[PDB]
Design a protein around this nucleic acid. Structure first.
Ligand SMILES: Nc1ncnc2c1ncn2[C@@H]1O[C@H](COP(=O)(O)OP(=O)(O)OP(=O)(O)O)[C@@H](O)[C@H]1O
Ligand SMILES: [Mg+2]
Ligand SMILES: [Mg+2]
Ligand SMILES: [Mg+2]
Ligand SMILES: [Mg+2]
Ligand SMILES: [Mg+2]
Ligand SMILES: [Mg+2]
Ligand SMILES: [Mg+2]
Ligand SMILES: [Mg+2]
Ligand SMILES: [Mg+2]
Ligand SMILES: [Mg+2]
Ligand SMILES: [Mg+2]
Ligand SMILES: [Mg+2]
Ligand SMILES: [Mg+2]
Ligand code: NA
Ligand code: NA
Lengths: 177, 85, 136, 307, 50
RNA sequence: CCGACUUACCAACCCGAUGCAAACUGCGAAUACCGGAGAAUGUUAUCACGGGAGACACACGGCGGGUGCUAACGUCCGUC
RNA sequence: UCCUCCUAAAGAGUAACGGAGGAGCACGAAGGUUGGCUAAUCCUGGUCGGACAUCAGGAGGUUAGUGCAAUGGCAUAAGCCAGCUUGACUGCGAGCGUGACGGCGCGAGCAGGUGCGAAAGCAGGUCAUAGUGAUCCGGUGGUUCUGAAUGGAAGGGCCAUC
RNA sequence: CGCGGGGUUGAGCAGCCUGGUAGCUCGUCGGGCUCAUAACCCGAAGAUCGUCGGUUCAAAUCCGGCCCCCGCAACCA
RNA sequence: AAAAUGACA
């Protein structure tokens, strides 16, 4: 896209010279951006997922895959097979194309922004993120909305540990605190 | 006088017929075709060379020969095979 | 009282009591009470032989109970004719073979141990003996 | 594919009469007709030369045209003489007496189960000519329940809507040929109950479509209320797929209905509507007309609504 | 014992039928299966009946 | 809200040590049973068909058990 | 009455008013094939959202699942999903197993047509074992087999079924 | 040492009848009427369904063990 | 139509 052409030669050399890498592959690469929201409260209405599914489809240009309840839980009053959330997994140009718009024209519209948390890592160099509101994207009209739907975005990387996971995102100007 | 005291019952005490499962032709027996070697309920013995498996998992011969018991396989699961006589 | 919590099946067959024991050697404490006879050792003889041990040294050391009943014993009521089921469960016993270390103690001097053990054995229906841990 | 509900019904009354049948079987003839059509049809059928069998829920259409009347209550059908109001009187006696004898049978079976578990005494036997009869009484209880059950219902009130529900002025929508609404100007306020009446095909169904924005007004603009929770009951039901199961169509393929206060109910919402819990996987197409009417009614009273 | 016995009378005219069961309160549709007709010795379409 | 904290405790899971099980098994005999070959021995002891039956209330003793109180010249099974 | 486990003594079988549970069904897909797939549980990170929902990667390796008990099995899956479908066929059947019998069962292969697959092939119901009732009598459909002087018919028989 | 039934906001009682629903009358509390109390009227709160498990996605309900209570039966010698 | 009662000093 308009970020991949940058990574293939620049971020490589910003890390090959940094982390003492003799190979263009010991450096990590970011391979997929999974993305999903768990609607959860769709027990009252199916329209709370019929219209919500069009929200990920309006952010990612991919029709979402509805997820389902893996195991019945009495407390949440669900059983196997409920559609309780939509999920999108992005790879390739659509991975990079969305990666471009999020860290450029979607992050700076977060209300009360004071940097990006850095301790949210899973010991293997993957990033997880929330937004708490979906109107921060330029694909939501404020008139098609009825709730405050949030998201969970989990950047999944091939880095072998967390401490270099920051470097992969930092070289893309990731607003770590 | 209080001679005979009342007695209770038993909630259980029912059972079913025996199905006579087992091995009908032990190893080294010359056996004909289509005859029954071992009766199963699962598959404790699998089907090797020249033998088959019924819907009951009954193992039957396919061609005449001798009965062979063997333990080939990565998971050490027992087979049955029939030679060529 | 040393009665099991949450067994799998309520009633159990009588069985037999043959062979020797397994816990033949002192392992936790420093002195132990070994059994020379065979028999079934109920849950109340275990307790009455544990009061007679605690109340002897009166505070000191630890007392280990190496055995646990986990074996129901059923008894028909008075004046019942035979059959019509199996007896309802009454109490729990542990089966004892020769050479099984029943109780064992630590932190008490040997001469105090001998008299303390000699007072518990009086409450058990089997001929016991006093044994001493060895390097092995 | 264009006519109204009243006209579509008229076509189905013609297609069943082109053949000039000697036997006319009219299942629910007067459903979407107006008073003029019903008034005219009451003379068409009276002059009709052959024989007519019809099922009508109109208590006024039946009186004008019913030579004989037939029950078909619970697997058995019985006839009745006299005018229509006679049947109501004679049927109520049939229901009262059958209610009277039904309780008496339970009375015997009630006191024949205190006796089965009574003590025997000294050396007596407990006659099996009475134990077997009680076995036949308990077996006979697999019988018809004489009262169908007066299906019970209740609505789900929600927060009050805005004081103005619909406002449309200067609105004038006209179909190609004739005008349906010409320069309307009206308001619908909170708690106002309005009845749309008129002739056939005069725009009642399309007027609601303008209100919900189904189809666009030619001019004049419509403004909708601000906290509305619409519950919609179409002329042709059209909101239940005839193949989907009864349980899934009711509450949109989900368990945990909300009843009264909090969502502490699931699938018991059928028992309030006299659905047997056994017949919960029946495809909707199998249900009768009235059963399908209530099922669509059931799931509208199933969700909060101000409208 | 909800299920009710039914038979599939052949459309090939030759009086022939297989019999089976069917849950009639959850299957309003009528079966139409292709099965052997030994009288005509061909595979024809069998439709439901009494 | 935070638990800001002491711990005579109700205790998951893991670790090292120690026991129990008819309805537990990552192990596992002795015997018995099925089939094949061999000599010796046994007035066919084997099998099929046919004529005639009786018997179908068992008892104790050893060994392996269920039940009973590891009671009974008790009771119910297997083998001799 | 029928099914599963122990008693039951390492082939089969084996009793008690011995110890524990289940069945009188369900399914035109939950059956046949051809493709593809692999759980429980815990840890870490993440909006509401939590002890337990969805998501990501780690350990673990079937402790999960099977339409319903228990046992035996199952990764080549017998579990999960999808396309096409009707072999949940007709006539037979070497050779066996189990019963005192009535019976009950497993079955390579042959012929006639059929489904899936590019084919090698697989398919005569469902991972297996419960989900059931003799005969007589009568009802429905088919078939010149018979038809009390002859030609019919009635009424019998054979096949399918209640 | 055998058989039936019961245990449900302070009281009484339905819901257990083939498993998803906890309700009715009196009482209690808070207002109102009256000089004041009754009565009357108008609103609220209050139950882990005796206890310990077991199936079930789901238990007041189905199964088992115990605790308390209440009826009934203990005959032929 | 309903309309009961109020320690002693
Ligand atoms: N889809 C359509 N295409 C064309 N004309 C239509 C369509 N739907 C309705 N109409 C016409 O619009 C007019 C009003 O129809 P509508 O359905 O609103 O009737 P209605 O007033 O509700 O009457 P009724 O009580 O008979 O159902 C009629 O003339 C009808 O033929
Ligand atoms: Mg006899
Ligand atoms: Mg006898
Ligand atoms: Mg005997
Ligand atoms: Mg004897
Ligand atoms: Mg055996
Ligand atoms: Mg043996
Ligand atoms: Mg299946
Ligand atoms: Mg496959
Ligand atoms: Mg399958
Ligand atoms: Mg099965
Ligand atoms: Mg003749
Ligand atoms: Mg005939
Ligand atoms: Mg008074
Ligand atoms: Na209309
Ligand atoms: Na109807």
């Amino acid at each position: 896209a308009k970020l991949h052409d940058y990574y293939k030669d620049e971020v490589v050399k910003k890390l090959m010279t940094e982390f003492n890498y003799n190979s263009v592959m010991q450096v990590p690469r970011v391979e997929k951006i999974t993305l999903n929201m768990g609607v959860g409260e769709a027990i009252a209405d199916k329209k709370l997922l019929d219209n919500a599914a069009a929200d990920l489809a309006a952010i990612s240009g991919q029709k979402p895959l509805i997820t389902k309840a893996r195991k019945s839980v009495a407390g949440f009053k669900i059983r196997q097979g409920y559609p309780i959330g939509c999920k999108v997994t992005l790879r390739g140009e659509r991975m990079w194309e969305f990666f471009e718009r999020l860290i450029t024209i979607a992050v700076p519209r977060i209300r009360d922004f004071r940097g990006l948390s850095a301790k949210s890592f899973d010991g293997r160099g993957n990033y997880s993120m929330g937004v708490r509101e979906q109107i921060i994207f330029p694909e939501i009209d404020y008139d098609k909305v009825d709730r405050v739907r949030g998201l969970d975005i989990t950047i999944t990387t091939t880095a072998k540990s967390d401490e270099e996971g920051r470097a992969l995102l930092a070289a893309f100007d990731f607003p770590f605190r | 006088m209080a001679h005979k005291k009342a007695g209770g019952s038993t909630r259980n005490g029912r059972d079913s017929e025996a199905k006579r499962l087992g091995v009908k032709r032990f190893g080294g027996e010359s056996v004909l075709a289509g005859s029954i070697i071992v009766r199963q309920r699962g598959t404790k013995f699998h089907a090797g060379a020249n033998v088959g498996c019924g819907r009951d998992h009954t193992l039957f011969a396919k061609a005449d020969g001798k009965v062979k018991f063997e333990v080939k396989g990565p998971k050490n699961r027992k087979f049955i095979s029939i030679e060529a006589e | 009282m040393l009665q099991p919590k949450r067994t799998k099946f309520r009633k159990m067959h009588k069985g037999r009591n043959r062979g020797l024991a397994q816990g033949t050697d002192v392992s936790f404490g420093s002195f132990g009470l070994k059994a020379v006879g065979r028999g079934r050792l109920t849950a109340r003889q275990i307790e009455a032989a544990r009061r007679a041990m605690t109340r002897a040294v009166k505070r000191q050391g630890k007392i280990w109970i190496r055995v646990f009943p986990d074996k129901p014993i059923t008894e028909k009521p008075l004046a019942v004719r035979m059959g019509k089921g199996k007896g309802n469960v009454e109490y729990w016993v542990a089966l004892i073979q020769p050479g099984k270390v029943l109780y064992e103690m630590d932190g008490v001097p040997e001469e105090l141990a001998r008299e303390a053990f000699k007072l518990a054995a009086a409450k058990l229906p089997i001929k016991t003996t006093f044994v001493t841990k060895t390097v092995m | 594919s264009s006519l109204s509900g009243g006209w579509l019904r008229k076509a189905a009354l013609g297609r069943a009469l082109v053949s000039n049948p000697r036997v006319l079987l009219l299942d629910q003839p007067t459903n979407h007709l107006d008073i003029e059509t019903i008034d005219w049809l009451e003379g068409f059928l009276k002059t009709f030369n052959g024989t007519i069998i019809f099922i009508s829920h109109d208590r006024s259409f039946i009186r004008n045209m019913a030579t004989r009347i037939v029950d078909l209550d619970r697997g058995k059908l019985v006839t009745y003489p006299g005018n229509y109001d006679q049947y109501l009187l004679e049927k109520e006696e049939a229901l009262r007496v059958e209610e009277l004898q039904n309780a008496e049978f339970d009375r015997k079976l009630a006191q024949e189960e205190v006796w089965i578990r009574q003590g025997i005494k000294a050396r007596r036997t407990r006659n099996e000519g009475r134990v077997r009869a009680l076995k036949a009484m308990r077996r006979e209880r697999g019988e018809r329940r004489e009262v169908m059950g007066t299906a019970k219902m209740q609505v789900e009130e929600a927060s009050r809507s805005g004081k103005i529900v619909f406002e449309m002025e200067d609105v004038c929508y006209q179909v190609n040929g004739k005008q349906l609404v010409k320069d309307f100007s009206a308001q619908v306020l909170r708690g106002d109950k309005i009845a749309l009446i008129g002739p056939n095909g005069c725009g009642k169904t399309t007027l609601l479509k303008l209100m919900l924005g189904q189809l666009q007004a030619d001019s004049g603009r419509i403004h909708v209320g601000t906290k509305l929770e619409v519950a919609y009951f179409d002329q042709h039901r059209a909101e239940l797929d005839p193949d989907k199961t009864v349980m899934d169509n009711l509450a949109e393929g989900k368990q945990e209905v909300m009843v009264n206060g909090k969502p502490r109910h699931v699938l018991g919402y059928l028992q309030d509507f006299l659905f047997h819990p056994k017949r919960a996987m029946t495809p909707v197409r199998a249900l009768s007309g009235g059963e399908r009417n209530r099922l669509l009614l059931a799931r509208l009273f199933l969700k909060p609504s101000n409208l | 014992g909800i299920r009710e016995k039914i038979k599939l009378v052949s459309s090939a005219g030759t009086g022939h039928f297989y019999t089976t069961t069917k849950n009639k309160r959850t299957k309003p549709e009528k079966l139409e299966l292709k099965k052997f007709d030994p009288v005509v010795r061909q595979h024809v379409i069998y439709k439901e009946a009494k």
